Amino acid sequence: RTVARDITLLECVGKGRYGEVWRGSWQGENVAVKIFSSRDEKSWFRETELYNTVMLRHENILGFIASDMTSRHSSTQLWLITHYHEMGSLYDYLQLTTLDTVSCLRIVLSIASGLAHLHIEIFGTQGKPAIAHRDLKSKNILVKKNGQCCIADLGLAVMHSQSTNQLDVGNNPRVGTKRYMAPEVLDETIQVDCFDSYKRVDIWAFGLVLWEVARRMVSNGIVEDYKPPFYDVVPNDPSFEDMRKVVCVDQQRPNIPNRWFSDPTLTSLAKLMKECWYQNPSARLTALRIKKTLTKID
Ligand SMILES: Cc1c(-c2cccc3ncccc23)ccc2nc[nH]c(=O)c12
Protein backbone atom coordinates (compact mmCIF):
# COMPACT_ATOMS: atom_id res chain seq x y z
CA ARG A 1 0.00 0.00 0.00
CA THR A 2 2.86 2.40 0.83
CA VAL A 3 4.65 3.20 -2.44
CA ALA A 4 7.09 5.92 -3.46
CA ARG A 5 4.58 7.52 -5.85
CA ASP A 6 2.35 8.39 -2.88
CA ILE A 7 5.01 9.96 -0.62
CA THR A 8 5.55 13.72 -0.58
CA LEU A 9 9.20 14.62 0.00
CA LEU A 10 9.08 17.49 2.51
CA GLU A 11 12.55 18.07 3.96
CA CYS A 12 16.07 16.74 3.47
CA VAL A 13 17.39 15.60 6.86
CA GLY A 14 20.56 13.87 5.67
CA LYS A 15 23.12 13.75 2.86
CA GLY A 16 26.22 11.65 2.31
CA ARG A 17 28.02 9.28 0.00
CA TYR A 18 25.08 6.92 0.62
CA GLY A 19 22.58 9.30 -0.97
CA GLU A 20 20.00 11.36 0.92
CA VAL A 21 17.51 10.92 3.74
CA TRP A 22 14.19 12.73 3.49
CA ARG A 23 11.29 13.38 5.78
CA GLY A 24 8.25 12.44 3.71
CA SER A 25 4.50 12.73 4.18
CA TRP A 26 2.47 9.59 3.47
CA GLN A 27 -1.22 10.19 4.22
CA GLY A 28 -0.30 13.00 6.61
CA GLU A 29 1.97 10.78 8.71
CA ASN A 30 5.72 11.40 8.63
CA VAL A 31 7.90 8.73 7.03
CA ALA A 32 11.65 8.45 6.56
CA VAL A 33 12.93 7.88 3.02
CA LYS A 34 16.53 7.02 2.13
CA ILE A 35 17.19 7.64 -1.56
CA PHE A 36 20.34 5.68 -2.38
CA SER A 37 23.16 7.13 -4.43
CA SER A 38 24.24 5.30 -7.56
CA ARG A 39 27.49 4.27 -5.88
CA ASP A 40 25.58 2.68 -2.96
CA GLU A 41 23.04 0.63 -4.92
CA LYS A 42 24.38 -2.64 -3.51
CA SER A 43 23.50 -1.50 0.03
CA TRP A 44 19.90 -0.98 -1.10
CA PHE A 45 19.77 -4.54 -2.44
CA ARG A 46 21.17 -5.90 0.83
CA GLU A 47 18.75 -3.91 3.01
CA THR A 48 15.84 -4.87 0.76
CA GLU A 49 16.82 -8.51 1.25
CA LEU A 50 17.04 -8.25 5.06
CA TYR A 51 13.81 -6.28 5.46
CA ASN A 52 11.74 -8.18 2.88
CA THR A 53 13.11 -11.73 2.71
CA VAL A 54 14.54 -12.13 6.22
CA MET A 55 11.66 -9.96 7.49
CA LEU A 56 13.80 -8.20 10.09
CA ARG A 57 11.61 -6.57 12.75
CA HIS A 58 12.41 -5.60 16.36
CA GLU A 59 11.54 -2.64 18.57
CA ASN A 60 15.24 -1.67 18.71
CA ILE A 61 15.70 -1.96 14.92
CA LEU A 62 14.57 0.87 12.64
CA GLY A 63 11.02 0.06 11.57
CA PHE A 64 10.87 -0.93 7.91
CA ILE A 65 7.83 0.14 5.85
CA ALA A 66 8.58 -0.74 2.22
CA SER A 67 11.18 -1.03 -0.51
CA ASP A 68 10.40 0.70 -3.78
CA MET A 69 11.88 1.94 -7.04
CA THR A 70 10.80 5.22 -8.62
CA SER A 71 11.82 6.62 -12.00
CA ARG A 72 12.36 10.37 -11.78
CA HIS A 73 14.53 12.77 -13.78
CA SER A 74 15.24 10.08 -16.40
CA SER A 75 16.88 7.91 -13.72
CA THR A 76 15.69 5.15 -11.39
CA GLN A 77 15.96 5.79 -7.65
CA LEU A 78 16.10 3.01 -5.05
CA TRP A 79 14.03 3.95 -1.98
CA LEU A 80 13.98 2.49 1.53
CA ILE A 81 10.93 3.75 3.44
CA THR A 82 10.98 3.50 7.25
CA HIS A 83 9.34 4.89 10.37
CA TYR A 84 10.20 8.52 11.15
CA HIS A 85 11.55 9.42 14.60
CA GLU A 86 11.10 13.08 15.53
CA MET A 87 14.06 12.99 17.95
CA GLY A 88 16.46 12.10 15.12
CA SER A 89 19.77 10.30 15.13
CA LEU A 90 21.62 9.59 18.35
CA TYR A 91 24.48 11.62 16.85
CA ASP A 92 22.41 14.79 16.52
CA TYR A 93 20.47 14.09 19.72
CA LEU A 94 23.50 13.89 22.01
CA GLN A 95 24.63 17.28 20.73
CA LEU A 96 21.35 18.93 21.76
CA THR A 97 20.86 17.62 25.32
CA THR A 98 22.55 15.99 28.30
CA LEU A 99 21.37 12.85 30.07
CA ASP A 100 20.57 11.74 33.59
CA THR A 101 21.39 8.23 34.78
CA VAL A 102 18.09 6.65 33.79
CA SER A 103 18.13 8.13 30.29
CA CYS A 104 21.76 7.16 29.73
CA LEU A 105 21.16 3.53 30.65
CA ARG A 106 17.87 3.30 28.75
CA ILE A 107 19.74 4.40 25.61
CA VAL A 108 22.69 2.02 25.80
CA LEU A 109 20.60 -0.96 26.91
CA SER A 110 18.18 -0.44 24.03
CA ILE A 111 21.13 -0.49 21.60
CA ALA A 112 22.51 -3.65 23.25
CA SER A 113 19.08 -5.23 22.95
CA GLY A 114 18.97 -4.28 19.28
CA LEU A 115 22.42 -5.73 18.64
CA ALA A 116 21.71 -8.93 20.57
CA HIS A 117 18.61 -9.41 18.40
CA LEU A 118 20.75 -9.21 15.26
CA HIS A 119 23.54 -11.50 16.50
CA ILE A 120 21.34 -14.30 17.86
CA GLU A 121 19.94 -16.85 15.41
CA ILE A 122 16.37 -18.09 15.89
CA PHE A 123 16.18 -21.73 14.88
CA GLY A 124 13.45 -23.73 13.17
CA THR A 125 11.06 -23.29 10.27
CA GLN A 126 11.53 -19.82 8.76
CA GLY A 127 14.00 -18.99 11.53
CA LYS A 128 16.00 -15.80 11.46
CA PRO A 129 19.76 -16.15 10.84
CA ALA A 130 22.45 -14.56 12.95
CA ILE A 131 23.24 -11.09 11.60
CA ALA A 132 26.27 -8.84 12.06
CA HIS A 133 25.77 -5.14 11.32
CA ARG A 134 29.33 -3.96 10.40
CA ASP A 135 28.64 -0.19 10.36
CA LEU A 136 27.30 0.52 13.84
CA LYS A 137 27.75 4.19 14.79
CA SER A 138 25.82 7.01 16.41
CA LYS A 139 24.60 8.29 13.04
CA ASN A 140 23.12 4.83 12.34
CA ILE A 141 21.08 4.94 15.58
CA LEU A 142 17.79 6.79 16.07
CA VAL A 143 16.11 7.98 19.28
CA LYS A 144 12.47 7.05 19.79
CA LYS A 145 9.85 8.96 21.77
CA ASN A 146 10.01 6.46 24.64
CA GLY A 147 13.70 7.24 25.20
CA GLN A 148 14.94 3.99 23.65
CA CYS A 149 16.91 3.80 20.41
CA CYS A 150 16.88 1.59 17.33
CA ILE A 151 19.64 0.46 14.96
CA ALA A 152 19.47 1.34 11.26
CA ASP A 153 21.44 0.79 8.04
CA LEU A 154 21.73 -2.94 7.23
CA GLY A 155 23.60 -2.31 3.97
CA LEU A 156 26.66 -4.29 5.10
CA ALA A 157 24.86 -7.01 7.06
CA VAL A 158 26.47 -10.46 7.15
CA MET A 159 24.37 -13.52 7.96
CA HIS A 160 25.10 -16.99 9.30
CA SER A 161 23.13 -20.17 10.03
CA GLN A 162 24.52 -22.67 12.53
CA SER A 163 22.69 -25.60 10.91
CA THR A 164 24.12 -25.35 7.38
CA ASN A 165 27.13 -23.39 8.68
CA GLN A 166 26.43 -21.12 5.69
CA LEU A 167 28.11 -17.71 5.83
CA ASP A 168 26.56 -15.02 3.60
CA VAL A 169 28.80 -11.94 3.33
CA GLY A 170 26.96 -10.54 0.31
CA ASN A 171 28.71 -8.59 -2.43
CA ASN A 172 29.19 -4.94 -1.53
CA PRO A 173 32.23 -2.76 -2.33
CA ARG A 174 31.11 -0.50 0.54
CA VAL A 175 33.50 -0.31 3.49
CA GLY A 176 32.47 0.52 7.04
CA THR A 177 32.98 3.94 8.56
CA LYS A 178 36.73 4.27 9.06
CA ARG A 179 36.42 6.19 12.35
CA TYR A 180 34.71 3.16 13.94
CA MET A 181 36.85 0.46 12.32
CA ALA A 182 38.14 -2.24 14.65
CA PRO A 183 41.90 -2.92 14.80
CA GLU A 184 41.71 -6.34 13.15
CA VAL A 185 40.09 -4.56 10.19
CA LEU A 186 42.64 -1.74 10.02
CA ASP A 187 45.57 -4.19 9.97
CA GLU A 188 43.78 -6.87 7.92
CA THR A 189 44.13 -9.79 10.33
CA ILE A 190 40.36 -10.25 10.62
CA GLN A 191 39.24 -13.77 9.67
CA VAL A 192 36.76 -13.04 6.89
CA ASP A 193 35.33 -16.58 6.61
CA CYS A 194 34.44 -16.80 10.31
CA PHE A 195 31.11 -15.31 11.34
CA ASP A 196 32.24 -14.53 14.89
CA SER A 197 34.75 -12.07 13.40
CA TYR A 198 31.97 -9.76 12.21
CA LYS A 199 30.14 -9.90 15.54
CA ARG A 200 33.32 -8.87 17.34
CA VAL A 201 33.59 -5.90 14.98
CA ASP A 202 30.11 -4.81 16.07
CA ILE A 203 31.17 -5.01 19.73
CA TRP A 204 34.17 -2.74 19.14
CA ALA A 205 31.91 -0.18 17.46
CA PHE A 206 29.30 -0.56 20.20
CA GLY A 207 31.96 0.21 22.80
CA LEU A 208 32.63 3.48 20.99
CA VAL A 209 28.94 4.44 20.92
CA LEU A 210 28.69 3.69 24.64
CA TRP A 211 31.62 6.08 25.12
CA GLU A 212 29.80 8.75 23.09
CA VAL A 213 26.66 8.38 25.21
CA ALA A 214 28.27 8.15 28.65
CA ARG A 215 30.18 11.41 28.10
CA ARG A 216 26.80 13.18 28.02
CA MET A 217 25.59 11.77 31.35
CA VAL A 218 25.76 14.40 34.08
CA SER A 219 27.42 13.46 37.36
CA ASN A 220 27.99 15.87 40.26
CA GLY A 221 27.29 18.84 38.01
CA ILE A 222 29.89 17.80 35.41
CA VAL A 223 29.47 16.58 31.83
CA GLU A 224 31.64 16.28 28.72
CA ASP A 225 30.75 18.00 25.46
CA TYR A 226 29.68 15.66 22.72
CA LYS A 227 32.67 14.42 20.76
CA PRO A 228 33.03 11.61 18.20
CA PRO A 229 35.47 8.77 18.91
CA PHE A 230 39.13 9.71 18.47
CA TYR A 231 38.21 13.37 17.95
CA ASP A 232 41.59 14.38 19.38
CA VAL A 233 43.94 12.20 17.28
CA VAL A 234 42.32 12.10 13.81
CA PRO A 235 40.88 14.73 11.47
CA ASN A 236 37.40 14.81 9.97
CA ASP A 237 36.79 12.08 7.39
CA PRO A 238 39.81 10.19 8.78
CA SER A 239 41.91 8.13 6.40
CA PHE A 240 42.60 4.43 6.74
CA GLU A 241 46.23 5.19 7.61
CA ASP A 242 45.13 7.72 10.23
CA MET A 243 43.02 5.13 12.05
CA ARG A 244 45.64 2.38 12.00
CA LYS A 245 48.25 4.73 13.50
CA VAL A 246 45.93 5.60 16.40
CA VAL A 247 44.16 2.29 16.99
CA CYS A 248 46.86 -0.22 15.96
CA VAL A 249 50.30 1.40 16.11
CA ASP A 250 49.76 3.51 19.23
CA GLN A 251 47.17 1.10 20.69
CA GLN A 252 45.11 4.14 21.68
CA ARG A 253 41.54 4.09 22.99
CA PRO A 254 38.96 6.72 23.98
CA ASN A 255 40.03 8.35 27.24
CA ILE A 256 37.97 7.84 30.40
CA PRO A 257 37.31 11.20 32.12
CA ASN A 258 38.46 11.15 35.72
CA ARG A 259 35.08 12.46 36.89
CA TRP A 260 33.58 9.10 35.87
CA PHE A 261 35.28 7.49 38.87
CA SER A 262 33.08 9.57 41.20
CA ASP A 263 29.88 7.98 39.82
CA PRO A 264 29.05 4.27 40.21
CA THR A 265 27.15 4.08 36.91
CA LEU A 266 29.88 5.68 34.81
CA THR A 267 32.56 3.61 36.56
CA SER A 268 30.75 0.40 35.59
CA LEU A 269 30.18 1.73 32.07
CA ALA A 270 33.87 2.63 31.85
CA LYS A 271 34.72 -1.00 32.62
CA LEU A 272 32.10 -2.27 30.15
CA MET A 273 33.40 0.08 27.45
CA LYS A 274 37.00 -1.09 27.75
CA GLU A 275 35.96 -4.76 27.59
CA CYS A 276 34.74 -4.05 24.06
CA TRP A 277 38.09 -2.59 23.02
CA TYR A 278 40.57 -5.46 23.40
CA GLN A 279 43.06 -5.66 20.56
CA ASN A 280 42.47 -9.43 20.79
CA PRO A 281 39.03 -9.69 19.14
CA SER A 282 38.13 -12.89 21.01
CA ALA A 283 38.55 -11.23 24.43
CA ARG A 284 35.68 -8.78 23.82
CA LEU A 285 32.32 -9.32 25.52
CA THR A 286 29.40 -10.69 23.52
CA ALA A 287 26.29 -8.67 22.76
CA LEU A 288 24.18 -10.82 25.09
CA ARG A 289 26.73 -10.33 27.88
CA ILE A 290 26.69 -6.57 27.36
CA LYS A 291 22.89 -6.61 27.47
CA LYS A 292 22.90 -8.65 30.69
CA THR A 293 25.41 -6.33 32.36
CA LEU A 294 23.52 -3.21 31.29
CA THR A 295 20.34 -4.72 32.71
CA LYS A 296 22.00 -4.97 36.15
CA ILE A 297 23.78 -1.60 36.25
CA ASP A 298 21.76 1.21 37.86
C1 LIG B 1 15.36 7.03 10.21
C2 LIG B 1 16.23 8.25 10.01
C3 LIG B 1 17.47 8.16 9.33
C4 LIG B 1 18.04 6.98 8.85
C5 LIG B 1 19.28 6.65 9.41
C6 LIG B 1 19.97 5.50 9.01
C7 LIG B 1 19.42 4.68 8.04
C8 LIG B 1 18.16 5.00 7.47
N1 LIG B 1 17.65 4.15 6.51
C9 LIG B 1 16.47 4.40 5.91
C10 LIG B 1 15.74 5.53 6.27
C11 LIG B 1 16.23 6.41 7.23
C12 LIG B 1 17.48 6.13 7.85
C13 LIG B 1 18.26 9.29 9.18
C14 LIG B 1 17.83 10.52 9.64
C15 LIG B 1 16.58 10.63 10.31
N2 LIG B 1 16.18 11.94 10.78
C16 LIG B 1 14.92 12.11 11.45
N3 LIG B 1 14.08 10.98 11.66
C17 LIG B 1 14.46 9.72 11.21
O1 LIG B 1 13.69 8.80 11.42
C18 LIG B 1 15.78 9.53 10.49
Short mmCIF file of N, CA and C and ligand atoms in Angstrom, two decimals, residues 13-14 18 20-23 31-36 47 51 62 80-89 92 139-142 150-154, ligand 1:
data_model
loop_
_atom_site.label_atom_id
_atom_site.label_comp_id
_atom_site.label_asym_id
_atom_site.label_seq_id
_atom_site.Cartn_x
_atom_site.Cartn_y
_atom_site.Cartn_z
N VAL A 13 16.81 15.67 5.52
CA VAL A 13 17.39 15.60 6.86
C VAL A 13 18.76 14.96 6.86
N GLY A 14 19.25 14.49 5.72
CA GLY A 14 20.56 13.87 5.67
C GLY A 14 21.13 13.74 4.27
N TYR A 18 26.14 7.91 0.75
CA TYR A 18 25.08 6.92 0.62
C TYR A 18 23.91 7.41 -0.22
N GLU A 20 20.67 10.36 0.09
CA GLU A 20 20.00 11.36 0.92
C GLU A 20 18.95 10.68 1.78
N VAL A 21 18.64 11.31 2.91
CA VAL A 21 17.51 10.92 3.74
C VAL A 21 16.52 12.07 3.73
N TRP A 22 15.25 11.74 3.54
CA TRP A 22 14.19 12.73 3.49
C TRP A 22 13.15 12.43 4.55
N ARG A 23 12.55 13.49 5.07
CA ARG A 23 11.29 13.38 5.78
C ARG A 23 10.18 13.49 4.74
N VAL A 31 7.12 9.92 7.32
CA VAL A 31 7.90 8.73 7.03
C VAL A 31 9.33 9.16 6.73
N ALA A 32 10.26 8.23 6.90
CA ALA A 32 11.65 8.45 6.56
C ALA A 32 11.97 7.73 5.26
N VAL A 33 12.61 8.43 4.33
CA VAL A 33 12.93 7.88 3.02
C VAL A 33 14.42 8.08 2.78
N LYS A 34 15.14 6.98 2.56
CA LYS A 34 16.53 7.02 2.13
C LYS A 34 16.57 6.77 0.63
N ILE A 35 17.05 7.75 -0.12
CA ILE A 35 17.19 7.64 -1.56
C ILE A 35 18.66 7.35 -1.83
N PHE A 36 18.95 6.14 -2.31
CA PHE A 36 20.34 5.68 -2.38
C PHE A 36 21.07 6.31 -3.56
N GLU A 47 19.80 -4.29 2.06
CA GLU A 47 18.75 -3.91 3.01
C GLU A 47 17.39 -4.42 2.56
N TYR A 51 15.12 -6.74 5.02
CA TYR A 51 13.81 -6.28 5.46
C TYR A 51 12.67 -7.05 4.82
N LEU A 62 15.36 -0.09 13.39
CA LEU A 62 14.57 0.87 12.64
C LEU A 62 13.42 0.18 11.91
N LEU A 80 14.22 3.29 0.33
CA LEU A 80 13.98 2.49 1.53
C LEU A 80 13.14 3.36 2.46
N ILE A 81 11.89 2.97 2.67
CA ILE A 81 10.93 3.75 3.44
C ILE A 81 10.81 3.14 4.82
N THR A 82 10.98 3.97 5.86
CA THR A 82 10.98 3.50 7.25
C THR A 82 10.16 4.45 8.12
N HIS A 83 9.90 4.01 9.35
CA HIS A 83 9.34 4.89 10.37
C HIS A 83 10.17 6.16 10.48
N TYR A 84 9.53 7.24 10.92
CA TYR A 84 10.20 8.52 11.15
C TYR A 84 10.21 8.84 12.64
N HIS A 85 11.39 9.13 13.18
CA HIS A 85 11.55 9.42 14.60
C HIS A 85 11.87 10.90 14.77
N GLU A 86 10.95 11.64 15.41
CA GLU A 86 11.10 13.08 15.53
C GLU A 86 12.42 13.46 16.21
N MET A 87 12.86 12.66 17.19
CA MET A 87 14.06 12.99 17.95
C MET A 87 15.34 12.87 17.13
N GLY A 88 15.32 12.13 16.03
CA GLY A 88 16.46 12.10 15.12
C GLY A 88 17.49 11.04 15.47
N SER A 89 18.67 11.21 14.88
CA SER A 89 19.77 10.30 15.13
C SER A 89 20.37 10.53 16.51
N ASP A 92 22.91 13.43 16.36
CA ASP A 92 22.41 14.79 16.52
C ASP A 92 21.82 14.99 17.91
N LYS A 139 25.44 7.81 14.12
CA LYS A 139 24.60 8.29 13.04
C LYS A 139 23.67 7.22 12.49
N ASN A 140 23.98 5.94 12.73
CA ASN A 140 23.12 4.83 12.34
C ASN A 140 22.23 4.37 13.49
N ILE A 141 21.98 5.23 14.47
CA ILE A 141 21.08 4.94 15.58
C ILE A 141 20.10 6.10 15.71
N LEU A 142 18.83 5.78 15.91
CA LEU A 142 17.79 6.79 16.07
C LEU A 142 17.18 6.70 17.46
N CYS A 150 16.94 2.73 18.24
CA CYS A 150 16.88 1.59 17.33
C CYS A 150 18.00 1.71 16.31
N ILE A 151 18.50 0.55 15.87
CA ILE A 151 19.64 0.46 14.96
C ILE A 151 19.15 0.46 13.52
N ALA A 152 19.84 1.21 12.66
CA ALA A 152 19.47 1.34 11.26
C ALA A 152 20.67 1.03 10.37
N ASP A 153 20.41 0.99 9.06
CA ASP A 153 21.44 0.79 8.04
C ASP A 153 22.00 -0.63 8.03
N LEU A 154 21.30 -1.55 7.37
CA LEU A 154 21.73 -2.94 7.23
C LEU A 154 22.41 -3.20 5.89
C1 LIG B 1 15.36 7.03 10.21
C2 LIG B 1 16.23 8.25 10.01
C3 LIG B 1 17.47 8.16 9.33
C4 LIG B 1 18.04 6.98 8.85
C5 LIG B 1 19.28 6.65 9.41
C6 LIG B 1 19.97 5.50 9.01
C7 LIG B 1 19.42 4.68 8.04
C8 LIG B 1 18.16 5.00 7.47
N1 LIG B 1 17.65 4.15 6.51
C9 LIG B 1 16.47 4.40 5.91
C10 LIG B 1 15.74 5.53 6.27
C11 LIG B 1 16.23 6.41 7.23
C12 LIG B 1 17.48 6.13 7.85
C13 LIG B 1 18.26 9.29 9.18
C14 LIG B 1 17.83 10.52 9.64
C15 LIG B 1 16.58 10.63 10.31
N2 LIG B 1 16.18 11.94 10.78
C16 LIG B 1 14.92 12.11 11.45
N3 LIG B 1 14.08 10.98 11.66
C17 LIG B 1 14.46 9.72 11.21
O1 LIG B 1 13.69 8.80 11.42
C18 LIG B 1 15.78 9.53 10.49
#
